[PDB]
Design an enzyme around this catalytic site. Structure first.
Site, PDB file in Angstrom:
ATOM      1  N   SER A 175       0.946  -1.077   0.266  1.00  0.00           N
ATOM      2  CA  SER A 175       0.908  -0.647  -0.247  1.00  0.00           C
ATOM      3  C   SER A 175       0.743   1.595  -0.293  1.00  0.00           C
ATOM      4  CB  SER A 175      -0.960   0.018   1.003  1.00  0.00           C
ATOM      5  OG  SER A 175      -1.502  -0.831   1.230  1.00  0.00           O
ATOM      6  N   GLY A 176       0.089   2.548  -0.619  1.00  0.00           N
ATOM      7  CA  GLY A 176       1.270   3.369  -0.914  1.00  0.00           C
ATOM      8  C   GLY A 176       2.414   3.335  -1.981  1.00  0.00           C
ATOM      9  N   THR A 180      -1.884   2.944  -8.297  1.00  0.00           N
ATOM     10  CA  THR A 180      -3.602   3.491  -8.980  1.00  0.00           C
ATOM     11  C   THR A 180      -2.981   4.903  -9.266  1.00  0.00           C
ATOM     12  OG1 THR A 180      -4.582   2.874  -6.511  1.00  0.00           O
ATOM     13  CG2 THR A 180      -5.233   4.780  -7.490  1.00  0.00           C
ATOM     14  N   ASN A 228      -2.373   4.451   3.523  1.00  0.00           N
ATOM     15  CA  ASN A 228      -2.699   5.620   2.682  1.00  0.00           C
ATOM     16  C   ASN A 228      -3.536   6.536   2.715  1.00  0.00           C
ATOM     17  OD1 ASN A 228      -2.814   6.303  -0.094  1.00  0.00           O
ATOM     18  ND2 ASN A 228      -3.055   3.862  -0.914  1.00  0.00           N
ATOM     19  N   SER A 231      -7.048   4.952  -0.133  1.00  0.00           N
ATOM     20  CA  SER A 231      -6.848   3.972  -0.601  1.00  0.00           C
ATOM     21  C   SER A 231      -7.269   3.098  -0.749  1.00  0.00           C
ATOM     22  CB  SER A 231      -7.022   2.449   1.174  1.00  0.00           C
ATOM     23  OG  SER A 231      -5.738   3.718   1.984  1.00  0.00           O
ATOM     24  N   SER A 232      -7.209   1.752  -1.695  1.00  0.00           N
ATOM     25  CA  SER A 232      -7.804   1.360  -2.919  1.00  0.00           C
ATOM     26  C   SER A 232      -9.376   0.349  -2.180  1.00  0.00           C
ATOM     27  CB  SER A 232      -7.607   0.089  -4.091  1.00  0.00           C
ATOM     28  OG  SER A 232      -6.873  -0.364  -3.339  1.00  0.00           O
ATOM     29  N   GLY A 454      -3.299  -3.272  -2.931  1.00  0.00           N
ATOM     30  CA  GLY A 454      -1.695  -3.852  -2.397  1.00  0.00           C
ATOM     31  C   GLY A 454      -1.707  -4.584  -1.127  1.00  0.00           C
ATOM     32  N   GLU A 456      -1.818  -6.102   2.587  1.00  0.00           N
ATOM     33  CA  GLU A 456      -1.767  -5.302   3.810  1.00  0.00           C
ATOM     34  C   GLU A 456      -1.192  -5.540   4.748  1.00  0.00           C
ATOM     35  OE1 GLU A 456      -3.699  -2.924   3.675  1.00  0.00           O
ATOM     36  OE2 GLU A 456      -5.954  -2.999   2.845  1.00  0.00           O
TER      37      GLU A 456
HETATM   38  N1  LIG Z   1       3.923   8.966 -10.116  1.00  0.00           N
HETATM   39  C1  LIG Z   1       3.535   9.281  -7.908  1.00  0.00           C
HETATM   40  N2  LIG Z   1       3.050  11.044  -9.270  1.00  0.00           N
HETATM   41  C2  LIG Z   1       2.466  11.748  -8.114  1.00  0.00           C
HETATM   42  N3  LIG Z   1       2.177  11.387  -6.780  1.00  0.00           N
HETATM   43  C3  LIG Z   1       2.541   9.988  -6.016  1.00  0.00           C
HETATM   44  C4  LIG Z   1       2.541   9.503  -7.211  1.00  0.00           C
HETATM   45  N4  LIG Z   1       2.692   7.781  -6.568  1.00  0.00           N
HETATM   46  C5  LIG Z   1       2.114   8.070  -5.600  1.00  0.00           C
HETATM   47  N5  LIG Z   1       1.785   9.323  -5.188  1.00  0.00           N
HETATM   48  C6  LIG Z   1       1.164   9.871  -3.661  1.00  0.00           C
HETATM   49  O1  LIG Z   1       1.230   8.856  -2.713  1.00  0.00           O
HETATM   50  C7  LIG Z   1       0.104   8.060  -2.820  1.00  0.00           C
HETATM   51  C8  LIG Z   1       0.328   6.923  -2.445  1.00  0.00           C
HETATM   52  O2  LIG Z   1       0.221   5.679  -3.851  1.00  0.00           O
HETATM   53  P1  LIG Z   1      -1.380   5.771  -4.803  1.00  0.00           P
HETATM   54  O3  LIG Z   1      -1.105   5.160  -5.745  1.00  0.00           O
HETATM   55  O4  LIG Z   1      -2.411   6.295  -3.924  1.00  0.00           O
HETATM   56  O5  LIG Z   1      -1.410   4.033  -3.533  1.00  0.00           O
HETATM   57  P2  LIG Z   1      -1.474   2.827  -4.274  1.00  0.00           P
HETATM   58  O6  LIG Z   1      -0.580   2.454  -5.001  1.00  0.00           O
HETATM   59  O7  LIG Z   1      -1.645   1.777  -3.040  1.00  0.00           O
HETATM   60  O8  LIG Z   1      -3.013   2.578  -4.720  1.00  0.00           O
HETATM   61  C9  LIG Z   1      -0.968   8.888  -3.248  1.00  0.00           C
HETATM   62  O9  LIG Z   1      -1.866   8.693  -3.357  1.00  0.00           O
HETATM   63  C10 LIG Z   1      -0.087   9.890  -3.915  1.00  0.00           C
HETATM   64  O10 LIG Z   1      -0.451  11.356  -3.133  1.00  0.00           O
HETATM   65 MG   LIG Z   2      -4.354   1.336  -3.596  1.00  0.00          MG
END
Ligand SMILES: Nc1ncnc2c1ncn2[C@@H]1O[C@H](COP(=O)(O)OP(=O)(O)O)[C@@H](O)[C@H]1O
Ligand SMILES: [Mg+2]
Lengths: 915, 49, 49
Positions: A175-176, A180, A228, A231-232, A454, A456
């Site tokens: 996660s994080g 996404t 996160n 979180s999804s 992701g 957990e």
């Molecule tokens: N490529 C990116 N560009 C900008 N911010 C990012 C990026 N990847 C992650 N983040 C930041 O970190 C947070 C967690 O990543 P996210 O993709 O939401 O989690 P997960 O991979 O678990 O779905 C995002 O909501 C954003 O705030």
């Molecule tokens: Mg996610």
């Protein structure tokens, strides 16, 4: 962003040529050594005998004893910031960590690793995503540009078109990590590039809707967990469908493992699904009055109240969610249906039961919550209360009815809240699919885009996290299988004298521990066959798991105390412990049939639509094939997913969370090293460097690279394998760079990229030659225009001017005066006028004849098309009538079968009474 | 265009009728299976007594 | 001529699997030239539809 690129994208790769970058390291004898600092250590090496070493720490100047097996060669500075760890000379864990760490601290998040990419989460809005699609990553193949999710997406798209094989892009981290966000950037890139090439249909509306489908499903669905802020809480798999031209014809969105429980309870510092908080945060006072909205503090379901997230206002995101739903074209009655059902789920959170003094059976002290529910969902309070408090079931020969204790009523209210939100989400996914899947026929190809929840880790892990983590395990096993096993099986199959390498990295033991249905029964399959007995209890599930699986090498007796109702399991990323609180209810997910049919039979069309297909719903509360457990549903849908993924070329994107603090810039180097170890990154790069990662079919190799060796193949037809042998000898490739199989040519890393560079050089020279000929021919036209414009007028104008001077001066002026007198000129003018008007009407005659003929052919074709549509309309209507006949026959025989079944049960009763 | 939209309507209704008949046949099969189970077990009880 | 070049195509049973291989595509190239088709698409469609 193109100007920022020097900090965030590009590298002075020429430094790899630097000789002193090698010679200085060759002097310093610099090496890596492991450490407990929450940092990893560089050192220079000074003594050795036997298995022993001593090193001097470069930062400390201290010297320490070390083991020969703990030293790892530093690659010379020459390699620093290399875009692809497969290009490294001394591949080891400390060098990969160093390259990723220094690229990240410099702002470069994407790095290649052979046939896959690594990303480290920046936790910043970096200037990396807006301008880059316009020129920089549009069609630029992998070696042309620095690593980027756009380069991954373009590479997949090009492979899909070139190889005629469906792709998938798979984001994998805890996660994080970034799954996404990177999934969004993939969809944005595909939408942009596929709309850009529609030179008559660019910026189209489907590419407009695709960008909205993610914010909607994120407004629903996603939530602020501990780990996160977005979180999804569900897994999704987007399919983007393409035509033979490479333009998008459709998209589809599947969803998995939606955590219904998120709506009902949350941990101390967490939030529900966002849309609850968006709707309550200042949507509008008229909307609050209509939707019966109230302060957060009143609801059971919003644990610990008005929790907030940084940097975003819920009030703005509410409006953005409505904007997105409108761009998706959800009608306002359906949007308001969603908002009503959200409010109704909250209002179920207001219901309470009186704790009755006389006996354990109880009723509400106040109907007002049920009244609000009735006004939102459309089910009257009298039937609602009679159903939940006193449900009646029909069982064979007899009707049975029971009282409901306050706990049973609360469990019914919770089950209704969970299932109502789940059904609403599933409907919203169906609506988005219906909007995107515009073509009634599938595309020529597709790109799948996987974004699972992701991995957990909590102190509160449950069945939800068990299924999420099992899915992460099975996806990591897909990576391992693809990179190590199918890769080497391809070498064996094609006959390439390869000797099999064992990398470790088999997760099938733990996967079988969870999923296996026979032999030793796995945990998920075991409880699937224990929730049915009346003696069943989660403590007994724990004891049975300890008996049936407590001997498995990946199972563990609980970390902290063995006496509690806990499982503990070892997974690629972590060792995890899970509490069997209400897993009986969570795996079976029972509903009260009476209240579920009252929801189906609601006065509200929207709730009645959410509760279509109710007929399958479970017949009993808390005690088989007609129903299916959540375990079976997940296992079946995940098997369908994996069977889909296995039929595609996977493009993995390994996402790494640098620190648990959500801080920008900071790395925990041990957390990253743990991720690299469990992800199998260095094994994936080793198989890329040691093996032959690139394959080309002989005919495709000839057709593409014959431009490099045009005189090497005789002009006749020739076997592709022999043509390839000739090309490869004419290319003078070193015999270690390639191997020739039964159907493919195998190349080591970088060789085929070098051939693509050579090909682009040759094609550039050909285009330059064609441009030279084109620009020459344009000069020929210019010269011809100059020739005409000069040479004619040099005579003609001098002539006409000389006569203009003479003729007015000389007696020919008399002829000018006699010409108005002459009648012959008048008769000629009249004949010319007659001819001109005749020509006008003749042109209109011929044009009208042509127009009439063409339009008449259009009319005739439209008559034929009409006739065909009418014929198939008749076929469809007659098939409807035949289906209605079959429906009548079937319902009659069903009535007969019901009456006979009841008579048989009556006989069973009469026989037992007469005995 | 009228015939096209009429075809879309009648194909939609035909698909819904097919899906409904699929529900009816599934429920009929489940009913007949339980009826045959009760017939077999009542014959077994008649042989027992 | 294209029908004559069909069936000059020879398939070999793979040495380790129950799958067709075409270890010489010359006849398939001639077929594709005469029938107006791409060799690689024809070879895929035959060997793995
Ligand atoms: N490529 C990116 N560009 C900008 N911010 C990012 C990026 N990847 C992650 N983040 C930041 O970190 C947070 C967690 O990543 P996210 O993709 O939401 O989690 P997960 O991979 O678990 O779905 C995002 O909501 C954003 O705030
Ligand atoms: Mg996610």
């Amino acid at each position: 962003a193109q100007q920022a690129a020097d900090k965030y994208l590009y590298v002075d790769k020429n430094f790899i040529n630097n000789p002193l970058a090698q010679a200085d390291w060759a002097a310093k004898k610099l090496v890596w050594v492991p450490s407990d600092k929450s940092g990893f250590e560089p050192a220079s090496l000074k003594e050795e005998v036997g298995e022993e070493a001593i090193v001097e720490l470069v930062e400390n100047g201290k010297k320490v004893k070390v083991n020969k097996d703990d030293i790892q060669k530093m690659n010379p500075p020459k390699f620093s910031k290399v875009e692809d760890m497969a290009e490294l000379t001394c591949l080891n864990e400390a060098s990969v960590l160093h390259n990723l760490k220094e690229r990240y601290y410099s702002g470069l998040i994407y790095t290649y690793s052979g046939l896959f990419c690594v990303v480290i989460n920046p936790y910043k809005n970096l200037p990396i995503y807006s301008e880059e699609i316009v020129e920089m990553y549009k069609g630029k193949k992998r070696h042309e540009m620095p690593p980027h999710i756009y380069a991954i997406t373009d590479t997949a798209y090009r492979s899909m078109m070139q190889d005629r094989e469906d792709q998938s892009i798979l984001c994998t981290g805890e996660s994080g990590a970034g799954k996404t966000e990177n999934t969004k950037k993939v969809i944005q890139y595909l939408a942009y590039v596929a709309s850009s090439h529609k030179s008559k249909k660019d910026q189209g509306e489907l590419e407009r809707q695709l960008l909205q489908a993610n914010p909607i499903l994120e407004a629903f669905g996603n939530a602020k967990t501990v780990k996160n802020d977005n979180s999804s809480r569900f897994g999704k798999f987007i399919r983007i469908n393409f035509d033979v031209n490479g333009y998008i014809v459709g998209a589809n969105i599947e969803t998995y493992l939606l955590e219904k429980s998120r709506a009902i309870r949350q941990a101390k510092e967490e939030r529900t699904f966002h849309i609850f908080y968006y709707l309550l945060s200042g949507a509008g006072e008229h909307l609050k009055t209509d939707l019966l909205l109230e302060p957060y503090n009143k609801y059971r379901f919003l644990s610990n109240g008005h929790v907030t997230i940084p940097g975003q206002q819920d009030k703005d995101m509410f409006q953005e969610t409505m904007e997105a739903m409108r761009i998706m074209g959800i009608p306002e009655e359906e949007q308001m249906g969603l908002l009503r059902v959200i409010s109704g789920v909250l209002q179920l959170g207001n219901i309470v039961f009186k704790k009755e003094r006389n006996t354990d059976q109880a009723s509400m002290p106040d109907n007002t919550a049920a009244q609000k529910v009735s006004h939102l969902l459309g089910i009257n309070v009298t039937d609602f209360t009679r159903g939940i408090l006193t449900p009646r079931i029909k069982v064979g020969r007899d009707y049975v009815q029971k009282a409901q204790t306050k706990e049973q009523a609360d469990f019914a209210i919770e089950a209704l809240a969970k299932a109502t939100y789940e059904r609403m989400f599933r409907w919203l996914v169906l609506r988005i699919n219906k909007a995107l899947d515009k073509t009634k026929r599938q595309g020529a190809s597709f790109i799948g885009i996987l974004d699972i929840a992701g991995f957990e880790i909590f102190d509160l892990n449950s069945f939800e996290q068990l299924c999420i983590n099992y899915t992460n395990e099975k996806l990591q096993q897909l990576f391992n299988h693809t990179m190590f096993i199918l890769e080497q099986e391809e070498y064996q199959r094609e006959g390439i004298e390869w000797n099999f390498i064992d990398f470790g990295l088999d997760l099938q033991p733990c996967i079988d521990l969870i999923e296996k249905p026979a032999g030793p029964p796995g945990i998920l399959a075991l409880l699937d066959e224990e929730c049915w007995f009346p003696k069943a209890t989660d403590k007994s599930f724990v004891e049975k798991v300890m008996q049936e699986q407590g001997t498995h090498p990946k199972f563990q007796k609980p970390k902290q105390l063995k006496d509690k109702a806990d499982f503990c399991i070892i997974h690629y990323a972590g060792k995890v412990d899970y509490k069997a609180d209400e897993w009986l209810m969570k795996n079976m997910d029972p509903l009260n049939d009476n209240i579920a049919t009252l929801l189906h039979q609601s006065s509200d069309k929207f709730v009645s639509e959410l509760w279509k297909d109710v007929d399958r719903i479970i017949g009993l509360d808390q005690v088989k094939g007609m129903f299916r457990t959540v375990g079976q549903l997940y296992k079946e849908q995940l098997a369908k997913l994996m069977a889909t993924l296995r039929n595609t070329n996977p493009n993995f994107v390994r996402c790494i969370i640098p620190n648990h603090e959500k801080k920008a810039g900071k790395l925990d180097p041990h957390l990253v090293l743990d991720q690299l170890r469990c992800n199998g990154v260095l094994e994936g790069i080793r198989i890329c460097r040691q093996g032959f990662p690139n394959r080309v079919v002989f005919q495709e190799f000839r057709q593409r690279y014959e431009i490099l060796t045009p005189n090497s193949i005789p002009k006749g037809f020739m076997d592709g394998k022999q043509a390839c042998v000739l090309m490869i000898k004419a290319l003078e490739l070193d015999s270690n760079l390639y191997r020739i199989g039964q159907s493919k040519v195998f190349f080591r890393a970088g060789v085929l990229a070098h051939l693509e560079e050579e090909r682009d050089l040759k094609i550039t020279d050909v285009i330059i030659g064609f441009q030279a000929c084109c620009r020459g021919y344009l000069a020929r036209k210019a010269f011809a225009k100059r020739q005409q414009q000069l040479t004619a007028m040099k005579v003609l104008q001098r002539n006409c001017a000389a006569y203009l001077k003479l003729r007015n001066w000389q007696w020919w002026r008399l002829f000018t005066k006699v010409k108005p007198l002459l009648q012959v000129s008048r008769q000629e003018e009249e004949m010319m006028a007659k001819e001109e008007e005749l020509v006008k009407v003749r042109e209109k005659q011929l044009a009208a004849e042509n127009r009439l003929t063409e339009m008449e052919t259009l009319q005739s074709q439209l008559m034929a098309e009409k006739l065909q549509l009418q014929e198939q309309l008749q076929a469809e209507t007659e098939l409807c009538a035949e289906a209605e006949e079959l429906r009548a026959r079937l319902t009659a025989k069903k009535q007969e079968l019901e009456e006979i079944c009841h008579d048989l049960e009556a006989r069973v009763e009469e026989e037992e009474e007469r005995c």
